[PDB]
Amino acid sequence: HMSTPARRRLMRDFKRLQEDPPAGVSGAPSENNIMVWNAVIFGPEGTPFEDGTFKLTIEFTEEYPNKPPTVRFVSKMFHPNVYADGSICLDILQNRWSPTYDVSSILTSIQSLLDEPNPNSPANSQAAQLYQENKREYEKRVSAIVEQSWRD
């Protein structure tokens, strides 16, 4: 759509993602609603999430880009900063959002978060406990959800 500054900016976000995506990310507006996007993030290489293909949804309001969207994993996730319902604790989504961030930088930020959990936001208490105390078992759990992410 093109009727509002938020919509035109989202279309520019979409253009950047089509023609120049960061490694391992994709996103597109939903067919009927430019405010709701579907996105995919590949787990970062050299991390337990490598080979994962994780679907997410992103919901915008007309305040975008001055207010961050809400982002949720749709794929099953096992990560200290991700709630059971897919909600994500990411500082640029909660505390230091900037209108200069776009869909691309949100997706790469979540990607980076997969590699480096924030110890301040233990949304998944078992994931934070294993990450803190038992990396082998943490990665076994992540491997499970990597394999599950190959199934919608």
Side-chain angles (χ1 to χ4, degrees):
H1 223 298
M2 301 289 266
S3 65
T4 62
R7 281 153 187 256
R8 293 187 303 267
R9 156 73 179 260
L10 281 166
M11 285 310 297
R12 283 191 301 274
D13 282 22
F14 183 39
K15 191 209 170 183
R16 203 154 309 259
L17 216 35
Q18 295 185 299
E19 63 193 17
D20 196 21
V25 314
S26 76
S30 66
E31 181 203 335
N32 293 308
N33 189 3
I34 193 196
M35 292 297 117
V36 169
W37 287 39
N38 303 108
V40 175
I41 291 166
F42 295 4
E45 299 184 25
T47 78
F49 293 84
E50 192 177 18
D51 292 1
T53 62
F54 305 112
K55 305 219 253 72
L56 313 93
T57 61
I58 310 174
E59 189 172 10
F60 300 90
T61 82
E62 298 287 351
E63 303 168 288
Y64 188 73
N66 290 296
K67 288 288 168 293
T70 65
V71 182
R72 279 191 201 86
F73 280 105
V74 172
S75 300
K76 277 318 112 217
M77 182 48 55
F78 187 83
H79 185 280
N81 304 132
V82 176
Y83 278 97
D85 74 348
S87 307
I88 307 166
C89 285
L90 179 60
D91 60 342
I92 68 164
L93 292 181
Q94 271 98 50
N95 307 286
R96 3 166 304 204
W97 172 253
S98 170
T100 64
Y101 303 160
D102 58 13
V103 175
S104 290
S105 60
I106 293 181
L107 298 179
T108 56
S109 295
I110 292 161
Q111 200 171 50
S112 291
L113 186 63
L114 295 181
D115 179 22
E116 289 218 275
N118 192 328
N120 305 332
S121 304
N124 176 342
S125 61
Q126 182 183 36
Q129 183 228 35
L130 292 186
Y131 185 77
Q132 166 65 24
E133 299 170 358
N134 191 342
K135 162 176 159 188
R136 184 190 196 79
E137 180 63 29
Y138 175 80
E139 293 186 343
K140 203 196 285 193
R141 302 292 297 272
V142 177
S143 289
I145 64 98
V146 168
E147 292 185 32
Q148 290 161 32
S149 76
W150 307 335
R151 305 307 176 187
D152 294 356

